[PDB]
Structures are given as C-alpha cells and as structure tokens.
C-alpha cells in the first residue's frame, strides 16, 4: 500500500512529485487552498487515482481531517508561500505558513497516531545558508538565513528534527538548490526572463526589468529534484540531504544565454540602478535594472555540495544549465505563440 | 482626490468594482494574495491600477499598504466565501472573514485615517440564515447557519464598534446573492451554467447537485457593486440591504439553463433518489448528491431593499431571467474556445 | 461517570464551580495557562482536582487535553473578559474569546465526542449592549458594544451551529454581572470594595472610578454556577438568561458600600468633575477619571431571567444589598490581615 | 533621554531589570499580560515606572504602546519560556517566542523608530542544545532540542535580519541559565530550594525530580540583566554570551541546597527508582519521575563569555555555592512567614 499525501500539490515541485508518484502506482492526495478562480493549472491533466482535498497549513483542524481520512504512508510537505522577496512584507504571514505550519503538519501526524507509520518530507532550502558560511555547502555546513523566509524555513528544518528526534518519526529534510522548469512561477527570476525574453522574440514586448544581476546560484531542473525526495524516503534511514547540481551561474549568465537562444547577444553599459542590457546588432535596449527588485539582505552565492545525496541515495542531476535554460525559453516561446496573454 | 484600496479585488465583486471606479477616473489599489500560480484571470485585462501582495490575516502587511495608498476609500471584499467550504476550513473562514476586517480597521486606525477614510465592509444575506421575517430588511434579526454568516456576523458587529465608538465612516453592505459569468465555478449557478454549456457540446453527460429547493434572491454582480460605492457617497454611514427581492429556487435556474440549450427538463424521484432527465432524449442530465448539501441550509431568502431606493437611488438593472441566460450564453462560449 | 473539563478554572466562575461540581461527586480537570508566577490563587485550597497546561489560541493542546480526560461535561468559561481592556487588545480578545470557543468545539468534533459530551458556554449580557429590549430575554436582538462584546457574539453563534450541524449538546448562559470577593480586583464591584475596605481601615483616602450612571443586574457567581450545571442536566439543550431582575447604578454601590463602613456619601459636581464627600466629616473619597469610560459604553443592563425560573427551578438567592455587604466584610477583613492584599 | 521598554517586566528577569534601569534614572515602561488574578508581585514594590495592557500575539496593541512609549531602548523579554511546557504548548510557544519577536520589531519600523531605538532580544542558551562545541561561544552552531528551543531560534535570526536589512541597533543576549530568589516555581532551581525549605520547615516530607543528571551552567539574574543593558551601551551592535562558565549537576544542586538545612543526600537506586536520603536520619525526601523529564534532553551547557568579558567589561559576581545558598535561606525565610507562599 503505497498513499501520498502532498501539501503545496499545485506548486511546480508538487505538480512534478504528483506526476512522478502516479507513475509508481501510488494513491496520491494532494491539499489545495481554497480559491476564488481556478488554481490547479498544473495538475488538471491528472485530473482516479489522484485525490485532492481543501486545506491549508494555518488551520489545525483541516489537517487532522485529511489525515485521518487519508492515513498516508508518505507526506510531502511542500506547502509553502516560497518566495524571497515577498516574504519581507509578507514575513508574518510566511512565518505562520513555512514555519509554524510545519509543526501544525506533524502534530496533526501525531494526533491522528501515525508517527510509527508514515515517512515525512520537510522541503527544506538552499536559504537556509544566506550569507554561506562554507563554499561549497554541505549538511554540516552552518546555516544564516538572510529573509523572514529563511527563517521561517529553518524554524521548519529543526521542528521536524525535533519531531524525528523526541518521537522516532521518520522524518527527513531535503535541503534543495534552486531548481527551475517550464512550470516555475512567474516571478521568480529564471521564468520572469525566459517569458520576456520569448516575447521578445515574438514582438510582444520590447524590454523588462531585473534587480541584482550579480547573483549567483546553483540552478538545477524541478523534475530531477522531486526524484531525490521521494529516495530520501526510501532510504533505510531518515537522513538530511543536500540536493543540488554543485554549479554556479549569475542572474546575468541566464539572461545572456536566453537571449543567445533567440538569435540575440546581450551587451551591457553602465553601474548599478543605471546598468542596461542592449542587442548589439541592433542597438535595442531590451533589460534595464530597478531597485524595487533588490533584496534588503541579498544572498549573493550559492553552491551546493551532495556527494551524500550521490553515495547514499544514487541521485544525481540529469539536467545541466545550458539544456535548462534552452527548455524554459523553447517552451514560453511556443506558450507564448499560441497565447499572447498566457 | 479619490484613491480606492480594495481587499478582495481578484474575486468576482471586486473585479467589476475595480472596472467601475476606474470609469469614475479612481486611483485603484488592489490587495492580491501571493500565490503559486497567477491568480489575476478577473482584472489582468485593467494592468491608474496598481496591486500590493497582502493578506487579511498578516496585521503589518495592512498597515504598511494603507500607509503607502492613503485611500479615501477602502472596499473589504476579501474572503472565503464559499458556505459549504466553511464548514470544514471553520477557524481559517474566521480569521480572514472575521478577524481579518478588526485587523484592516485597526490599521486604518494605526495609519490615522479614522476621520479621513470611508470603509465598505461586504456583509451578506447569510447573516440573515434561518430568517426572522419574510422579506429581510435591514432591521431583520440575524441568525447565521454556518461558520462563514458567523465570521460574518463578527465582522458586521467590529465594523459597527469602529463607527461607534471612533466616529469611522463605516457601513456594512448587506447584499443578497449576486452571480456574472465571473462567478466561482463553485458556486450554485456557476456550476449549473457550466455543467449545461458542456452537456450541450458533449463535454459531459450529467452532473449532481445538492439541496434542489433552496430559494435564492440572484442578482448581477455587475449592478451590485455600484451599491457600494453609492453608500460610500452617502452623506451618513448606514448600513444597507442590497437585493432584487424576486424569489427562484435552485431546481428553476437549472429548469431555466436548460431551456436556454434547448432542453426541457422533467424531474422524478424524491430526496437523494430525485433525478432530471431531458423530455426529448430520456437521458438523465441531472441528479442529486449528499456531499453537497449543507449540514444546516439557508433555506430561503428573499431581500427588502426599499431604504437603498429610497436613499441612495439604486435598482437593479438585471433580473434573473437575463442573469441565466448570460451565464448560460458566456459558459457555452467559454468551453467551446 | 462524571467528567468535568473547565477551560478558566482560576477565574472567579471557574473556582466556585470547581467547588460545586467536587461537592457532586466529580472529577475535575481545568486548564490552566503557563505563567511567570503563581496563577491558582483562586483554587489552590482544592489542590478529585487535575489540572493541564493549555491555551484557548492552541488547537493542538486542547485536542491532547480532551483526549486525555474524556470529559462528559465541558465548561468553556475561559476569556479575556474585561471589556474596557477589550478596546486595546481587540485581536487577542477576539482570537481568545470568539475563536477560542470554536478552537474547543472543533476539538470535541476531532476528539469523537460530539454525541457523548455536553458544551456549556459562558455568553454574557454584553451581547445585548445597546439594549434593544428592557428587560432583556433569550428573544432580545443582541446589539455589542465592545471588542469582548463582537467577539462574544461569534462565540454564541458558533455554538448553536454546532448544536444545529451536529447535534452537538451545547448551550449559551446568557449570564448577567456576577460578582463575589473573588472577583477580579479591575472590575468595578469589587475596585469599590477593595477601596471601600482600605479606607475604613485607613490604608486610602480616596479613589477614582469612570462612568458613575452605568446601570448593572449584579447577582452572586456562586448561584450562576449552579445554573451553568443545571443547563446541562436539562433533556434538551437550551440557551438561558440568568440574572436578577434587578437593577442598580455604580453610584448606587458606592453609596451601599460606604454605608457599610459607617459613611454617607454625598455627591457634588457633575461628569469628571463629579466628588463624592463623606457627609460627616467632609472628606473627599471618591473622584472621577476620564481614563475609566468606556468609547462605547454598555449604559444600561435588566435581565428576564423567566425561561430558567420556568425549565430549570433556578432562582438566585443572593441579592443587592447582600452582595453589597459580604464583598465590603470580606474585603476588610483581607486588607486588615494584609495590607498589600 | 533614557526611556525603556520592556515585554516580560512581570517575569525573573523583568523585575530585576526595571530595577536596574530604576536606579539609573530611566522612564520604565512594561507591557503586562491582562490576568484574572494579580500577576504583578515581583514589581509591585516599584508602583519613573507605568505597566501598558497587551500581548506579544496582538500586533496592533504593541504598535499602540511604541507609539506612546517612543522607547530609546527595547528589552523583549517576554516569553513562554519553559522547556517541558513548550512540548505540549508547541503552537502557542512558537507564536510567542517567535512570531511575537517579529511582531514587536515589525512594530518598532511601523512606528518610525526602526534609526533611533535600540532593541535587545532575550536569546538562550538552549539554541545550543545537543551542543556541538564545549565550552559553547557565540560561533558554535545552534542544535536546538525543543519547541522552546526552535521558537527562540527564529525570534535570534529575525532580529539579525531587521539589524542587517533596516540598519536597526538590535542584539541577541544568548544567556545560559540564570537564577535568584525570583525565579518561576517550575524551574528546577527554585522547584529545589522552594522544597528543601518546606522540608527544614517540616511543611514537606518529600519531592520528586526528573532528570538528576542534566548539567547546567548556573549565573544570578540580577548579574544577567545588567548584562543587557550593557549590550545596548555597546557603540555596534553584537551578540554575547552570557554565563558562568562553570558546570553543576541538578542532583548536585539538591546536594548543597540540602547541607544548607543541614542534611546529607546520599542516592540509591537508578533511573526512575533512584532516591535520595537523608544520612543521619534515612528519611527519603528525594525521588525521580519520568513525567518530569524532556523528550529530547539537553544534556550539558557550558558557556564561554570571553567576547562580553572584553568587550562590555561584564563578569559574572555571584558564583554557584552563593547561588544555592542564597535561593534556600530566600526560600526558607518565606515559607516561614507564609507556609501557603
Ligand atoms: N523551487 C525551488 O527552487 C525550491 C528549493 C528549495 C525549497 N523550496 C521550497 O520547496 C517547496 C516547493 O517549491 P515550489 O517551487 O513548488 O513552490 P510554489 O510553486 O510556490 O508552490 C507552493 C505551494 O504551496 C502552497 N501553499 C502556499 N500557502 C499555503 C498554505 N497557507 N496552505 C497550504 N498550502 C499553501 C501553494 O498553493 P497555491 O498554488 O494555492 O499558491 C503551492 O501549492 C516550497 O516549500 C518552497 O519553499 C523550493
Ligand atoms: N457574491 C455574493 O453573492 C456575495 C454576497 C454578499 C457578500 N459576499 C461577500 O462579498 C465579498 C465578495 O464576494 P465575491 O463573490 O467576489 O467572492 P470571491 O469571488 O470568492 O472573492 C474573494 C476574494 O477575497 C480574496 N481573499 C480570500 N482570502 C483572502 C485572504 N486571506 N487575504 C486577502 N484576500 C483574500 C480572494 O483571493 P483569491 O482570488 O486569492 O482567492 C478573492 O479576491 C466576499 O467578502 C463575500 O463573502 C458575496
Ligand atoms: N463574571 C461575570 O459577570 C460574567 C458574566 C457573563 C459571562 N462572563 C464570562 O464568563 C466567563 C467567566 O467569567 P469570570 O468572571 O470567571 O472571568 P475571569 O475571572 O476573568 O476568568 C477568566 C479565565 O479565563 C482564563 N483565560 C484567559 N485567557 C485565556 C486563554 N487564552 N486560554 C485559556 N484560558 C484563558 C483566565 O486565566 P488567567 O487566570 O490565567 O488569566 C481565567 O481562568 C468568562 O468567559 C467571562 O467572559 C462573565
Ligand atoms: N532565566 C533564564 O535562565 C533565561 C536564559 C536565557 C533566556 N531566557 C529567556 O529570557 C526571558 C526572560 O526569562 P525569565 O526567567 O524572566 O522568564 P519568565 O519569568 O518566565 O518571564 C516571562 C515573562 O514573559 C511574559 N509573557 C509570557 N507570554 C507572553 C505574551 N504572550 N505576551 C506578553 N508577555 C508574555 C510573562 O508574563 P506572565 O507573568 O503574565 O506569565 C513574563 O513577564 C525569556 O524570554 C526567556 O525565555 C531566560
Ligand atoms: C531554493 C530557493 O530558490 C528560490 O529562492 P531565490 O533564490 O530567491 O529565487 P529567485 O529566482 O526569486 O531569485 C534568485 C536570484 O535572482 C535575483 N534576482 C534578480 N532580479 C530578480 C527579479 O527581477 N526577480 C527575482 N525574483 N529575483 C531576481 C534575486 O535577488 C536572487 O539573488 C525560491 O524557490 C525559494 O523558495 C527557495 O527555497
Ligand atoms: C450572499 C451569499 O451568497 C453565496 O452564498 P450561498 O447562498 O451559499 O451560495 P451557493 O451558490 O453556494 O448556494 C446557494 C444555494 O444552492 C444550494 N445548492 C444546491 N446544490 C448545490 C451545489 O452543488 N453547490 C452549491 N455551491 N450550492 C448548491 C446551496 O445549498 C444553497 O442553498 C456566497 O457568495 C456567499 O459568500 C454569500 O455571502
Ligand atoms: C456580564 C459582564 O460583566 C462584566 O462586564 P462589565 O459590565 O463591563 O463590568 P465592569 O464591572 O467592568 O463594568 C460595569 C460598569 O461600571 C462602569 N465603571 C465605572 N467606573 C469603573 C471603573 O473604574 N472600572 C470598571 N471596571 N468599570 C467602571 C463601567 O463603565 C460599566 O458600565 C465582565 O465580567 C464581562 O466579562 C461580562 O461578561
Ligand atoms: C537558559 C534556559 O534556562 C531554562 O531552561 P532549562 O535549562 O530547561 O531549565 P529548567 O530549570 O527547567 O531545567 C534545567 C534542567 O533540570 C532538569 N530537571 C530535572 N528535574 C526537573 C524538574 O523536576 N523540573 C524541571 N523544571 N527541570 C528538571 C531538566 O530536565 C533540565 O535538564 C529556562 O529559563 C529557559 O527559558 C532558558 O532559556
């Protein structure tokens, strides 16, 4: 009997996860948020062997009732508002979501006495590190988190320690790198530029701006990354893991290599709020720079080490930057074609 | 000077008012929940527009948008409406729907703005519930049946409390059912509309429902939400029923949706059993289901708005028979692209 | 089996109904919340008594306590019940008094006991506010006029729907003012008789109070507890007024108060200017404070307390003038022993 | 103009502080929790000093109080600060201890104060926990061990984001235990003294303990609090660890407390049928109960203040032996006068 229950079902990671645990012949519930419009864009071509359920990590009562309906053997706790930037005006509402929720999740796993029996996922984050203590980072590497974000995710990170530690429940961390697909959300910086820069190339829009283009992170593919989850619970014990590619790129890197796959090469003047990006056959300038896009506490490198990941688990990366970048552009481009208002 | 800030603007009121206001040549913010995907499908046609991610349970987040939008006008639109959702999502339907309205008052109040802003709060026919008398008025007793008209109940009473107590211009909009093409593919006559545009292309055979005999006063969002604004160009702040005050049950719109496909539909059975076959074909289009019933209906309600005549001038424009055959034309047209 | 769970046992209610309910035979649990310092004051002389860390704002904890106990009978008198304090902590209020109540309901609900156990509670005459009605009875529209007020009035109403849903045994008292010498030192009997006690005993000269014409249906929270009990040995589950009948100004308490340590006050000046002047020696004991009113005040309270008189053979024994006296003698008789008391 | 803000000024280390601050001239400000008993016996002896209404959950009434207050200095104090309790009170924990924290720095920019106030946080040893260095110092990696632990965690990591993105003077004091004749009846320090006085007293035959041997690094809060103060005097703003240094068994706090009334403990037994008796008399007065101890220990602490010692010239002045001796005769001397204290 294999039944997942996946919070956070309708983000990129869940949808995938989904997808991937289908396959395997699982029953797969999934807890969606209630919403005044549609809001499972990603999962609908699902559509019985996938159930969803209305919840959210706020109220106690709902999660108790799902779990006890569904008595899980795997929960993947994915459920989260996930973005950095958001969550320094948002950073009590992220806290009660990615921290406090947590715990709502594995108490109600508690009270609903499945602690011997289920296997917990907490999605755990390269944020974690912030101002990186180590280069590259590891499991033992110390964590500084750098956003109401971060720490709302490392008060997550130790509950669930706590509840693996205090209780035996088999519950793990998956500590995930950045990772990206042709399903990420707008607004995060990959998929911002590979949708303008797509409709760029099809006249829709002339230019678009970024915020600090000196980032670097280690980008990797969503899809590979939902397969190191579910090894995590398949392993013998339940073990923290790091989850990344180990390779760094900037903000402006994906920028150059997506306009490179529309036929353009970016060339860069200026400093700053007043750096631009221009086509150097044309002239165009297509990016500009705004400080409303700033972080107030950046996190300005990140690369991830997962020699344990690779020795314990078998996992490995599938997808290299270069293939990401080209599948994310490809695939708003023939979105963006058949739908200017996609 | 005229800057709105709406809570809620995603959803089907708020869309229209937006719409509405910026024909007025209102200053429109927007308070929009982050979500996963885009949620904006309403109103991304309008982006004198400008939205703020927010959330009615994140106190600071308010403060922080009143202060930068020093609105003249603020339209707390913001829920989880859905009835039956309450019943199982109860303390979450209290914090957004109830707490959630103290917490935008009080950071209105936080902001200095007690003596410079007019509050719209969206009250609703639920408070109503089991009713007291037949039309409900403004004087009607409350009596809500469920943890939404008791969140809402909350919310009524905090808003009166600031206007008491802080001399807030604050008024509750009590409004009874309102639908559009825009309306939550969740709700009653959304949900036949839809069900009945795909019957009639072949997209699905059947669909069920739950208490067929439930009456509902339905209007047009449309017209409902100038009401709104009307009470907040009102020289006092009053409280205001808003209400076509015509009655239909739920087994007539979806009589009246399947004439508008050109299908009539003839009912047999009783309770759970009941089922709607089409008079031509003999198929069954329609049957009833368990699962959605609620565990204590609103079984009628039917809306006295003669004080909104007489002190703000509103009517409604559009009457059901025009509402169905809207949402049913709209919904044929939408799944057929 | 016998089973009584008490959400705020160390208020006053919840003392004397600890008391009654230990008298029957039952056992006892409350809940109780973590505190800096002692917090059991009320209670500590019984401690067939257990009681449990918990919050009304946790979920978790209740569900863990309710488990435990496997109450027959729940008491939900846990609050923050001063309506002048209401107005500044509005969130916390409504977060313990409004959702609180539903917090425990949908624990009940998880817990498997919806059928078995039996939900008292603790609704209030600050429900009626601006009395629509005089007196006011079960049928009275409700009309809040505070933070406490609003928040009390979800409390009510989620109740009945879960009594209406569920078939839940859950009831509304709709209790009047109820005083003792337990009562909380902030509210405004017992700030009069505390005050009252210390200047006959010479610890005082004089005090200021608020809204002096406030009318009030005071009765003794020893009688209402029995009611709460009695509301739940009924067949059906019903909501109930109780209260006196009876109405008085704070004036008026002030005045019976003094009384009882041989002064009569006489009052000159009017609104915050307002003195009250002992006859005898023309020394000024009590003044009036702006800071004391309320935005909104609650001006006038008469409760019809027919319903329960006619269901439930209660009627209280202790009126005004008694209450007065026993509140005056006891707290004289604390302040004479301790001085810092 | 020195006027102080502090959240906890009812707890152990809220009173001494308001003290401390007292004598050096301050305006003291505190915010108290509403109670339905008197929860102000560790100040009432200081009532410049005025107590505000509110709570760490409710964001509006901490904007109220800053606004009013317009603090120069900021001492979140306020806690649930008990480890066993936290297990059972996880929610309600992290909304305090946590979110609270963010609510009264989100407070402090709301009001305008984000360049002005300086803001320190009651940080703690226990975001040690399973500790991963000995001695501990302000760059050994964090393990926390408990609810408790992990709310403090993110409330230490939101006051070094509002330091590192608004440029606000805000500073984590990580302070290992500390004690006085103050402290909460529930920790194991007073939980000893307070018995081992009721047992001189003859008032007690017996008590049992948890845990016997957790090691803890023991200072006196009045030592602590000037600590504090002293961070905010910095010229940068930086973390400190605060402590002793020094490391005691709990069964060797029994130990000594015991020779201070003049008895010696010797232990029987293991695990949770270990006792303790008394040599001369073979009265047991000591046992153990599993209900006392932690789901996940915190084993042994030992802080290294070399960065305070240099920096804020801070040195801790009453050592263990002073501490025990100290708590016992306090506790002896109050049970004396009141056996119900
Ligand atoms: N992608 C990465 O690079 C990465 C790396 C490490 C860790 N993470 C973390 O990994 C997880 C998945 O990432 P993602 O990219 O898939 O995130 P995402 O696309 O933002 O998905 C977030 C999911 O959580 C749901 N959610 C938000 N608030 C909720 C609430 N209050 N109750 C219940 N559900 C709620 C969202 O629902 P709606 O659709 O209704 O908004 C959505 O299904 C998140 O926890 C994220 O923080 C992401
Ligand atoms: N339509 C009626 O017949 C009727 C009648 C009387 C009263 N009402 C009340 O009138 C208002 C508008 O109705 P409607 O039909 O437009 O509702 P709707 O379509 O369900 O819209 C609800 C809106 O509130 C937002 N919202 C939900 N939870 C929120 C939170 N936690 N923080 C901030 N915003 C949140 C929603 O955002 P998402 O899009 O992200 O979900 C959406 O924008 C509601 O208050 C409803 O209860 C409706
Ligand atoms: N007395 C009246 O005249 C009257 C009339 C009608 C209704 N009421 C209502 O009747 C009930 C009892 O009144 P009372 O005079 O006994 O009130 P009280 O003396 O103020 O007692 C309140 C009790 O509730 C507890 N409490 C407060 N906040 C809590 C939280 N967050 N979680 C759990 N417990 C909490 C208090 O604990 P602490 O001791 O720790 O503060 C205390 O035990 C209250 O609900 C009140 O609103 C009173
Ligand atoms: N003592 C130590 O060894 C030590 C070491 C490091 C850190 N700490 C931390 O240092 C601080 C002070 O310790 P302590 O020994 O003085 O603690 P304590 O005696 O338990 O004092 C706790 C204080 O916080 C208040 N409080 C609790 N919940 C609150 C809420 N929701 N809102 C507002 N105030 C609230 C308490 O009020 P009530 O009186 O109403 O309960 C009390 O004033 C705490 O943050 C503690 O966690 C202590
Ligand atoms: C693993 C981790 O991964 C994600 O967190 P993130 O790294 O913040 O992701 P992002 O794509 O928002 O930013 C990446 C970098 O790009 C910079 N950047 C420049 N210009 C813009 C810009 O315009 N938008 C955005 N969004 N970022 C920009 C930005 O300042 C940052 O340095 C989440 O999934 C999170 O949930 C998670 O856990
Ligand atoms: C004014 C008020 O208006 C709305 O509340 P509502 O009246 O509950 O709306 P509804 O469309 O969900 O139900 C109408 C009636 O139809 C019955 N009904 C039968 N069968 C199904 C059925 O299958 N689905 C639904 N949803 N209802 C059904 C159902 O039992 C009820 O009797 C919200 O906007 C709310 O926010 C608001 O404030
Ligand atoms: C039944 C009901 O009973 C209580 O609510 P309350 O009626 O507000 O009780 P109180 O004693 O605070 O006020 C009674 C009247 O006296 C006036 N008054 C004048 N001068 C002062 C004065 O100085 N202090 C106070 N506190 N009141 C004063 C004040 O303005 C009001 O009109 C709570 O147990 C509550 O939980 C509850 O449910
Ligand atoms: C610095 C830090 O300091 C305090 O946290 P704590 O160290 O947990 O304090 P405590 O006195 O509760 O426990 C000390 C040790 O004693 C053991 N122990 C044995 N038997 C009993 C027993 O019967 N009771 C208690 N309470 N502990 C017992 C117990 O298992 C633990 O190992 C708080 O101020 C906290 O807020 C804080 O931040």
Redesign the interface.
């Known amino acids: 009997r294999n039944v997942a229950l996946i919070t956070?079902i309708?983000?990129?990671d869940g949808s995938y996860l989904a997808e991937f645990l289908l396959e395997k012949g699982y029953e797969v519930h999934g807890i969606v948020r209630?919403?005044?419009?549609?809001?499972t864009?990603?999962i609908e071509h699902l559509y019985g062997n996938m159930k969803l359920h209305?919840?959210?990590l706020?109220?106690?009562?709902?999660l108790?009732?799902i779990i006890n309906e569904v008595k899980p053997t795997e929960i993947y706790n994915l459920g989260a508002?996930?973005?950095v930037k958001?969550s320094?005006?948002?950073?009590?509402?992220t806290?009660?979501v990615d921290?406090?929720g947590t715990?709502?999740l594995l108490?109600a796993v508690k009270?609903c006495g499945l602690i011997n029996s289920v296997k917990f996922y907490q999605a755990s984050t390269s944020e974690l590190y912030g101002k990186v203590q180590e280069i590259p980072q590891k499991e033992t590497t110390?964590?500084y988190?750098?956003?109401?974000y971060?720490?709302?995710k490392?008060?997550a990170y130790?509950?669930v320690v706590?509840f693996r530690?205090?209780?035996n429940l088999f519950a793990v961390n998956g500590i995930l790198f950045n990772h990206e697909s042709p399903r990420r959300?707008?607004n995060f910086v990959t998929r911002k530029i590979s949708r303008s820069v797509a409709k760029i190339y099809l006249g829709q829009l002339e230019c678009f701006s970024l915020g600090n283009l000196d980032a670097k992170r280690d980008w990797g593919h969503a899809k590979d990354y939902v397969e190191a989850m579910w090894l995590m619970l398949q392993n013998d014990e339940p073990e923290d893991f790091v989850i990344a590619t180990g390779e760094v790129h900037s903000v402006r890197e994906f920028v150059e290599k997506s306009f490179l796959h529309i036929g353009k090469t970016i060339v860069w003047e200026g400093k700053n709020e007043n750096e631009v990006g221009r086509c150097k056959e044309t002239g165009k300038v297509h990016v500009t720079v705004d400080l409303k896009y700033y972080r107030?506490?950046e996190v300005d490198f990140l690369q991830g080490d997962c020699t344990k990941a690779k020795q314990k688990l078998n996992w490995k990366p599938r997808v290299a930057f270069d293939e990401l970048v080209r599948e994310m552009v490809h695939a708003d481009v023939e979105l963006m074609r058949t739908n200017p208002?996609a």
């Open positions: 956070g309708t983000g990129q209630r919403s005044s419009s549609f809001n864009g990603r209305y919840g959210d706020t109220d106690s009562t709902c108790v009732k508002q996930s973005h958001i320094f005006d948002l950073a009590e509402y806290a009660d921290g406090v715990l709502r108490d009270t110390p964590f988190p750098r956003s109401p971060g720490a709302a490392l008060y130790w509950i706590n530690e205090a209780y959300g707008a107030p506490t208002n």
